[PDB]
Write an enzyme that holds these catalytic residues in place. Structure first.
Site, PDB file in Angstrom:
ATOM      1  N   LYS A  28       0.755  -1.263   0.175  1.00 29.94           N
ATOM      2  CA  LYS A  28       0.196   0.060   0.088  1.00 29.94           C
ATOM      3  C   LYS A  28       0.568   1.278   0.039  1.00 29.94           C
ATOM      4  O   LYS A  28       0.734   2.039  -0.722  1.00 29.94           O
ATOM      5  CB  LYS A  28      -0.682   0.051   1.388  1.00 29.94           C
ATOM      6  CG  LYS A  28      -1.841  -1.239   1.018  1.00 29.94           C
ATOM      7  CD  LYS A  28      -3.299  -0.444   1.902  1.00 29.94           C
ATOM      8  CE  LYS A  28      -4.227  -1.364   1.763  1.00 29.94           C
ATOM      9  NZ  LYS A  28      -4.939  -1.430   2.711  1.00 29.94           N
ATOM     10  N   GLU A  57      -5.001  13.622   9.538  1.00 28.60           N
ATOM     11  CA  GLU A  57      -5.713  13.808   8.359  1.00 28.60           C
ATOM     12  C   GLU A  57      -6.554  14.681   8.779  1.00 28.60           C
ATOM     13  O   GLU A  57      -7.068  14.916   9.010  1.00 28.60           O
ATOM     14  CB  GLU A  57      -5.999  12.136   7.919  1.00 28.60           C
ATOM     15  CG  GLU A  57      -4.625  11.561   7.905  1.00 28.60           C
ATOM     16  CD  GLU A  57      -3.486  11.343   6.986  1.00 28.60           C
ATOM     17  OE1 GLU A  57      -4.413  12.379   5.415  1.00 28.60           O
ATOM     18  OE2 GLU A  57      -2.592  11.195   7.383  1.00 28.60           O
ATOM     19  N   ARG A 111      -7.755  -6.631 -11.071  1.00 29.96           N
ATOM     20  CA  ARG A 111      -8.291  -7.676 -11.625  1.00 29.96           C
ATOM     21  C   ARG A 111      -9.719  -7.645 -11.263  1.00 29.96           C
ATOM     22  O   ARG A 111     -10.585  -6.920 -11.256  1.00 29.96           O
ATOM     23  CB  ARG A 111      -7.863  -8.476 -10.027  1.00 29.96           C
ATOM     24  CG  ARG A 111      -8.865 -10.482 -10.468  1.00 29.96           C
ATOM     25  CD  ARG A 111      -9.073 -10.878  -8.744  1.00 29.96           C
ATOM     26  NE  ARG A 111     -10.248  -9.876  -8.572  1.00 29.96           N
ATOM     27  CZ  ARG A 111     -10.262  -9.089  -7.613  1.00 29.96           C
ATOM     28  NH1 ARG A 111      -8.701  -8.910  -6.487  1.00 29.96           N
ATOM     29  NH2 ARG A 111     -11.050  -8.452  -6.334  1.00 29.96           N
TER      30      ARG A 111
END
Lengths: 678, 69, 68
Positions: A118, A202, A295
């Protein structure tokens, strides 16, 4: 380019049949794969050839990528489609396929490896310039730094902590110009939750709704983004119901979602089909990147109902084979237009009343909803199982997918309702009742549902119809008749018949009594929960004389006196009676009455147990003192002229030894007392 | 099991074969005394059974030199 | 029938393969052999086209020991 005539599939289930079908239209060969047994499964009955791979555990089956590659080489396979799961996300397997020379279907190995971590992925998107909401900025070096970037990097304040979900440092402090409470909140969070003193700030979003656009790319530098999607409804990170046309989404936004998505895919480089996922807050009005998947999703046929290319139906898997062909595209982003709305729902072989635990059992009767067009709506069902099949515990519980395309949302939602109702399965409890409850009472027909939408309405849901005393009457009657000639040819003297059934509904036994008056098998009565009435009953053809685990499936008719009439297809077994009709489906458990029928001994067993004859000389005792002995093991072995003659006592309860090995004992001595465990 | 009468058409049944290597096959075989026909992904092939008939009984190589009729 | 020749020829191939008869030998194997290897997909074949390629044709798959 390279010709393809043989197609290989990795996984099993609905995707196997889907990949196999279109293949027929392209006129290409097919190959199937199956685990130990698993050879009666449908997909193998759909392919041209199938190969067994090995033991049921997923480590043993569908994970030996090297063995799969060697087998494919021996078969001279042209292409492999991994599908989703197993080796769907493994760059080593794709690289080995490329080295072997087979056209892998999907992204290159580099993209999969990069998106595996990530941190490096978010690094790549941050370099690309896509609006991304990060997880962290630096650390809590200074408390004044918190005020420095509080109004700087991210005005919304997400205090939280370095780790841990307690989040008491948050305090839902959405008010800026906060400087005396944020530091106090963080310092009180540090207490008893010290962890690491580093703190990350954040942006905090009050609301969250998930978005995910689709994309497609050839290998000749040309692509086009498909329509958006919504996955707001999910329980415990499991997809439940989704909508390809995000209701309440402005056209202009749709357009832009594409420009952002194409930038990210081009930056990493991409070939084939994929999906970018966003996270969105209505109050802010902006979307921030969360994750992408390299995918094909499971939700591909859903978005299809809301997109047409050059006025023709779109097939997502088709293009992926054509992408592997090396041919370039034929359409710009323009040729694709949306038409109407559609909704989807997944059915899981789990029990809603329980902890959504999967159950494995044979599939007795499977109703199939009308998969044809009628009115202003299209409804389809795709199932990876059929009649006579059995669910495997190793696999995930997944039966079928139902999709209701329509010209308007209303039509689509209304369509499903009826379809969801119509589809019926007998043998294993399902969540189909839950989904219908999720659709009727919740006023989500408006179209605004958050990510946590399921959490608040849990009280309202998890509700099923109440078993009326009448339902017991048809259910009880079926078990008799669907087992024997009860009430058939019966006869007594100057009296009348009687026969009773005991149901273990919930944790309370239920008794139902049935009897007749006159010379009529037809006229029948009932008395359950102190409620009495009359009805007549007319059966159908007698079937399933072998009365196996599936037992007997027959239709029934019941004319109750009030005036009604009913039709009930009852597959009854000793364990339970299942009745399906206009009421719905209900399975009633029969009161269990089993308990070592025979060996029911409460005798004290005080003395004179496993007594040995005169010679004695006990030795080699292999039983521990004070251990339960229900099965007749050799408690003591005594030898009389080479006569082991083991006693082999079967008295239940722990056995207490009063002798030791090698001790000569007299005739009929109390070697041990076999007493009930107290 | 089908075609108990085993007439000229004989028996037409589907078969499954799991060879050790790992494969599996399905074969609808209508077999008769004259030949065995197998149809599957391989194609169609009919294999003739070795004929073994020759006046079973009247097989006399005796010279028959004299004292006849 | 097809929108293009290719589609048509390709279609037959699969169909010719699929149709199956048991009981009498047929030339269905011959026709498929006439369609795969000969490069008549171009479209230029003469009246005597069959005569020259007789060596190439009249060929059938080898009965593998498994088939027995």
């Amino acid at each position: 380019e390279r010709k393809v005539e043989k197609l290989l599939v990795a996984n099993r289930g609905e995707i196997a049949c889907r990949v196999f079908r279109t293949c027929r239209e392209m006129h290409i060969r097919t190959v199937a794969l199956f685990c130990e047994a698993e050879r009666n499964a449908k997909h193998v009955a759909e392919a041209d050839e199938a190969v067994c791979i090995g033991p049921p555990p997923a480590v043993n089956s569908y994970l030996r990528g090297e063995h799969i590659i060697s087998v494919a080489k021996q078969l001279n396979v042209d292409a492999i489609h991994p599908g989703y799961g197993f080796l769907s996300e493994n760059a080593s397997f794709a690289d080995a396929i490329t080295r072997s020379g087979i056209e892998f279907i999907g992204p290159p190995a580099s993209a999969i490896s990069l998106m595996g971590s990530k941190s490096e992925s978010k690094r790549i998107m941050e370099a690309a310039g896509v609006p991304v909401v990060p997880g962290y900025y630096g650390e809590n070096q200074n408390v004044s730094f918190l005020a420095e970037e509080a109004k700087k990097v991210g005005f919304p304040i997400l205090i939280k902590a370095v780790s841990g979900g307690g989040g008491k440092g948050m305090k839902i402090v959405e008010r800026p110009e906060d400087f005396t409470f944020m530091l106090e909140s963080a310092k009180r969070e540090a207490t008893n939750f010290f962890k690491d003193d580093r703190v990350i700030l954040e942006r905090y979003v009050k609301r969250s709704r998930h978005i995910e656009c689709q994309i497609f790319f050839d290998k000749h530098g040309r692509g086009v983004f498909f329509f958006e999607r919504d996955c707001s409804v999910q329980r415990r990170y499991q997809k439940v119901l989704e909508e390809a046309p995000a209701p309440h989404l402005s056209m202009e936004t749709r357009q832009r979602i594409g420009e952002v998505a194409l930038q990210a895919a081009k930056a990493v480089g991409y070939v084939g089909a994929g999906t970018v996922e966003f996270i969105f807050d209505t109050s802010t009005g902006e979307f921030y990147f969360m994750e992408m998947n390299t995918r094909l999703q499971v939700e591909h046929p859903v978005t299809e109902e809301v997109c047409r290319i050059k006025g023709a139906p779109l097939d997502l898997v088709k293009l992926q084979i054509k992408t592997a062909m090396g041919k370039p595209l034929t359409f710009s982003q323009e040729d694709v237009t949306l038409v109407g709305s559609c909704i989807e729902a997944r059915v899981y072989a789990e029990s809603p009343e329980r902890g959504f635990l999967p159950e494995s059992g044979p599939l007795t009767f499977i109703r199939e909803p009308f998969q044809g067009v009628r009115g202003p709506a299209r409804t389809r069902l795709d199932t990876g199982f059929r009649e006579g099949d059995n669910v495997l515990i190793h696999y995930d519980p997944m039966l079928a997918k139902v999709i209701s395309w329509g010209r308007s949302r209303e039509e689509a939602l209304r369509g499903l309702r009826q379809a969801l109702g119509e589809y019926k399965v007998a043998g294993i409890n399902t969540n189909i009742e839950f989904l219908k409850r999720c659709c009727e009472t919740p006023e989500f027909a408006r179209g605004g549902v958050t990510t946590n939408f399921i959490s608040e309405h849990e009280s309202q849901l998890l509700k099923s119809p109440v078993v009326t005393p009448e339902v017991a009457a048809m259910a009880a009657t079926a078990w008799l008749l669907n087992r024997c000639d009860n009430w058939r040819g019966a006869f007594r003297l100057n009296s009348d018949t009687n026969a009773t059934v005991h149901f273990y509904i919930d944790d309370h036994p239920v008794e139902v009594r049935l009897h007749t008056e006159g010379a009529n098998y037809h006229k029948i009565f009932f008395s359950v929960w102190d409620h009495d009435g009359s009805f007549e009953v007319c059966s159908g053809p007698v079937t399933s004389k072998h009365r196996d685990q599936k037992s007997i499936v027959n239709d029934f008719t019941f004319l109750f006196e009030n005036g009604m009439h009913h039709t009930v297809l009852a597959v009854a077994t000793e364990g339970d009676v299942t009745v399906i009709g206009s009421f719905g489906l209900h399975q009633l458990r029969l009161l269990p009455l089993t308990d070592g029928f025979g060996d029911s001994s409460t005798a004290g067993g005080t003395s004179t147990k496993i007594v040995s004859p005169m010679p004695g000389k006990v030795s080699k005792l292999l039983v521990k003192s004070g251990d339960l002995v229900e099965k007749g093991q050799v408690l003591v072995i005594v030898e009389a002229m080479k006569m082991e003659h083991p006693v082999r006592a079967l008295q239940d309860g722990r056995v207490s030894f009063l002798v030791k090995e090698g001790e000569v004992v007299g005739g009929d001595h109390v070697l041990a007392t076999v007493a009930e465990e107290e």
